[PDB]
Design a protein around this ligand. Sequence first.
Ligand SMILES: CCCCCCCCOCCOCCOCCOCCO
Ligand SMILES: OC[C@H]1O[C@@H](O)[C@H](O)[C@@H](O)[C@@H]1O
Length: 420
Amino acid sequence: EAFSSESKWMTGDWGGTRTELLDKGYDFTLDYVGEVAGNLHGGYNDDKTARYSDQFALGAHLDLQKILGWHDAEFKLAITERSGRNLSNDRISDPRAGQFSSVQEVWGRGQTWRLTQMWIKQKYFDGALDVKFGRFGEGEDFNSFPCDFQNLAFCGSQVGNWVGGIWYNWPVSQWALRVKYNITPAFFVQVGAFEQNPSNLETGNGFKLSGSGTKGAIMPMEAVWSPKVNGLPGEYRLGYYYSTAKADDVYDDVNGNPQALTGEAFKSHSSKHGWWVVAQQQVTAHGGDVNRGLSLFANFTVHDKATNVVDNYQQVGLVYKGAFDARPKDDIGFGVARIHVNDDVKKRAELLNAQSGINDYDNPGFVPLQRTEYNAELYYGFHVTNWLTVRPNLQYIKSPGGVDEVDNALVAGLKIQSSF
Ligand SMILES: CCCCCCCCOCCOCCOCCOCCO
Ligand SMILES: OC[C@H]1O[C@@H](O)[C@H](O)[C@@H](O)[C@@H]1O
């Protein structure tokens, strides 16, 4: 401890008192994430600049069994503040049809202070049933995926990205109940009910506890299989979500006519719904070391054609830990994602342009045809200490916002992760 290579905290164990608190059931954490991005070539605006965005996360993890005598119970408090600007908005995107993904995943949801987690959790029958209640985002339990890449498409719950209008990951919180049945040490099922309340997105409501503005509920379900394949760990997720809030059609007006022709309100549907798959698998163990080798990953996502802008999404990638004996804790990442836009969204746009008489893409009143956006990242993670990782990355974006008229973007990124 103190500032050392093997402490998982930069400030160490505070002369022992941190390790005591840990024994007594208290785990206090202060985690930092900084992301830099600068355009090197292409995208909507080719004036070269750089943007920086970051996040602090202050946490309190309580073992309520030691502290209160409550048999496997846990409390968690997390507060975040985020700061900075996003390259995706400021250079890459068409201003009237912004990028779906983002070259700085850590940016978004208001750049302020938020209550990001506040929940109590208890297990029953030797950890067979797991009940969790309080405030958190869907991605924390459902459709969960790590966040080492800088590009949004390869970080966190993807359902949270493409139906992010109602499903809100970290750092947004909402009242929620999540019930989990562990059928087998390597297989579980789970369902949840999340307050769905767009006012949580408004700056000012970073610490909202009231249920005012609730539009309905999101109800995710999931099966998560974590088998060993050839002695190597994998994790496979299959899920479905259902949302009880009203959503607008992407094309039909209230009468079933194309709304681009009428200007009347969109037809309203009483719900949204979709499915997802997450798969991650370690496929090699470098020279017999389980802690090194090649891991593959994939994500697929599918959404209701009626209301969702993103039709479907796919992502494939890999990461190698410890390619070289010299740097056994370093990693190499590569990922490709495809984000397809609901064709009716495009059809509606073609109609708009037809009716405004504006057919030139360079005309501000023209409404870009959104088709398919691709993202790719290649990164290298230096394991500086156990409390510091630094990963430069290279990002490539084909048709930002799905707009073929926007040149491919080459972006340079630097992602930093540290725990104090
Ligand atoms: C900060 C923007 C710069 C772009 C980052 C580039 C990341 C892509 O590089 C990944 C591949 O680099 C391979 C490193 O070679 C390994 C050297 O280690 C050998 C040990 O002796
Ligand atoms: O709320 C979900 C997601 O929204 C994005 O704006 C943030 O940059 C992500 O860090 C976050 O995971």
